[PDB]
């Protein structure tokens, strides 16, 4: 639904599927998907967008430290799970 745990999975899928990408491409697409959820209310998009945005930094950063992805001066690249 939400929470770091649910967004880290979104993040990790996105990056592998794109091979190479950026913070903004990742975040904008997660925001857009959450926002087009059938059970979502328009009044709540600005919050949410902000919140998903802060969440993505936390995910990228541990994922980074696990050597699962790249992130080198705005360029984020996939690597692999273990």
């Amino acid at each position: 639904g939400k929470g770091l745990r649910h967004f880290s999975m979104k993040v990790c899928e996105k990056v592998q599927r794109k091979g190479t990408t950026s913070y903004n491409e990742v975040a904008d697409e997660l925001v857009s998907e959450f926002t087009n959820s059938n059970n979502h209310l328009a009044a709540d998009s600005a919050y949410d967008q902000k919140n998903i945005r802060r969440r993505v930094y936390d995910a990228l950063n541990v994922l980074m430290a696990m050597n699962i992805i790249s992130k080198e001066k705005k360029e984020i690249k996939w690597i692999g799970l273990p």
């Binding site: 770091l4 990790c12 995910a59």
Partner: protein, 67 residues
């Protein structure tokens, strides 16, 4: 200095702490101290993303299993 206090660094430590403690079991209480004791909250930052990926799992309160 704001880099010394990065989730990412904490992460690296948590990992080493993790891979050292054999069995595959880690006590969230140990790491807490061992990890700068910067504040509990942060530990959950690490566990939530490792759980979302499926590299770990809650085994029992204050405790988690690798892979």
């Amino acid at each position: 200095s704001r880099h010394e206090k990065s989730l990412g660094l904490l992460t690296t430590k948590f990992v080493s702490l993790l891979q050292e403690a054999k069995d595959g079991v880690l006590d969230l209480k140990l790491a807490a101290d061992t990890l700068a004791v910067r504040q509990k909250r942060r530990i959950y930052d690490i566990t939530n993303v490792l759980e979302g990926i499926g590299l770990i799992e809650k085994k029992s309160k204050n405790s988690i299993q690798w892979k």
